[PDB]
Amino acid sequence: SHMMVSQETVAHVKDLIGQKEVFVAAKTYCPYSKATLSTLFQELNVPKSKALVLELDEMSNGSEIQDALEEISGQKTVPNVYINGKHIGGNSDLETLKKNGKLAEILKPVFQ
Template identity: 45%
Template sequence: MSYIYSYITSFFKSAGPVTPEILSGLKSNIDSAKVVVYSKTYCPYCKSTKSLLESIGQEYKVVELDTISDGLTLQNGLLELTGQKTVPNVFISGKHIGGNSDIQALNASGKLKELLA
């Protein structure tokens, strides 16, 4: 039930302004690990992305936007940085990869392992 509660209440939270400090913090976080995934705990596409990374033994840093107080603000900052409004929002070596369908396609084509090498 907590996932449903999180999902429903996420519509009623308000986002703060996306400041230069927010954008700088996002960029710093993105550069802090080989793979960074911005996610929401209840999102099936996020779960699929995380499962893929786990299945290939890839360590990754995850930020669950629905569990932190400034999650909506960070998601708006990610929209400014990437043009992508949805989660998961995946970065490899500081480069924006896209979402679940993008990382799944990279894996299917064999290109994901090249990016992770």
């Protein structure tokens, strides 16, 4: 579908992003996504209750969600991470924020 992704799907994806503090469009096969999930949930202990992780490969409309996410930011890759309104981007971006110390600042409201 790609750029044919509907307003409705895109609106729905925005709703999903807003549903939990931590949003990750993931792919179980994607190493960077496994890294991101590991970082958020294992290393940084983000409670799963505070996250929505969409395994796009496990979703029948996972492709359309990816397309929606691409419309929303331009990002074509997984993982696609949002935290508290912030489009973090992919794993390498998460990594930069982790090292920056900014990820912790971003996550502060999450643990609260």
